[PDB]
Structures are given as C-alpha cells and as structure tokens.
Amino acid sequence: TRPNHTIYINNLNSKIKKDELKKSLHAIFSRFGQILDILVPRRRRPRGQAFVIFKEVSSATNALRSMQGFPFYDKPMAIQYAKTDK
RNA sequence: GGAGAUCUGAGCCUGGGAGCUCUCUCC
C-alpha cells in the first residue's frame, strides 16, 4: 500500500451509532484538510471501520501520522491507507 | 437497477475479520 487520498480506520467503537461516528470523525479529521466524504460501511457484523477521503493526499498523510493509535471513544484508532483509493 | 437497514434482520466463510450471499425498507 502507498499514500492516497483515503485513510482506512479500523478498531472503532461499534457501540457508537453511525451518524455520531461520522460527525465525530469529521470534526477531528477535518483539522488536517478538506474532507470530501466519510464512509462508515454497513458490514455483516457490528461496523467498526470507516473511510475518510481527503481532497489532498498530503492531508491523509499527516492525519495518518498524527492520529495513529489515538484514543477515540475509549478505543485507539488503527489507521491505514486505503487498499483502493475511494 | 439506485439508495438505505442487524452491538436494534439472516445464513455461510474467517477463526489474529478491509470475505461472500440473502432478507427487508424506500425510489
């Protein structure tokens, strides 16, 4: 995997509802750059992962570095570059 | 077809979870 516009965040707190996770993510990650969209996809079992698509790859890079392992709803975020740019 | 829905619909697969397929709702 290599840098791209989208970051993949797993290990989120599934106890939080979708909309509240999307807005918290937007408020914290918008600090690094303009965000085009945030996806919290529906999966077979409790959704605990999201995609944040920044407008500039530089924003995804600093975000990936700064917020790596940072507590988010009492759970440390595990951040990656998306396998496929979204 | 499109858009949504399960810690609050479901069966498989996985067995150190970015998997597949259904069902339902709306257009």
Residue numbers in the entry: 6 to 91
Study authors write:
The viral trans-activator of transcription (Tat) protein uses an archetypal arginine-rich motif (ARM) to recruit the host positive transcription elongation factor b (pTEFb) complex onto the viral trans-activation response (TAR) RNA, leading to activation of HIV transcription. Using yeast display and multiple rounds of selection, a new class of TAR-binding proteins (TBPs) was identified that bind TAR with nanomolar affinity. Here, we present four co-crystal structures of lab-evolved TAR-binding proteins (TBPs) in complex with HIV-1 TAR. Although it was hypothesized originally that each TBP variant would recognize TAR using fundamentally different modes of binding, we demonstrated here that each TBP binds TAR using a conserved subset of arginine-to-guanine interactions within a lab-evolved β2-β3 loop.
To probe this outcome, we integrated five arginines into the β2-β3 loop of TBP6.7 as the Q48R/T50R mutant. ITC analysis revealed that the new variant recognizes TAR with KD of 27.8 ± 6.5 nm and a ΔΔG° of +0.9 kcal mol−1, corresponding to a Krel ∼5-fold weaker in binding than WT TBP6.7. Again, the structure indicated that only three arginines could bind simultaneously to the Hoogsteen edges of guanine bases in the context of the β2-β3 loop. This variant makes contacts to TAR in a manner analogous to both TBP6.3 and TBP6.9. Specifically, Arg-52 interacts with the pro-Rp nonbridging phosphate oxygen of Uri23 when displaced by Arg-50—as in TBP6.3. Arg-48 interacts with the pro-Sp nonbridging phosphate oxygen of Gua36 as in TBP6.9. Arg-47, Arg-49, and Arg-50 retain their interactions with major-groove guanines as seen in TBP6.3. No apparent backbone stabilization interactions form between β2-β3 loop residues. First, the addition of extra arginines in the β2-β3 loop—beyond the initial three—did not promote additional interactions at the Hoogsteen edges of guanine bases. Second, the need to maintain charge separation appears to have influenced arginine locations and rotamer conformations in the β2-β3 loop.
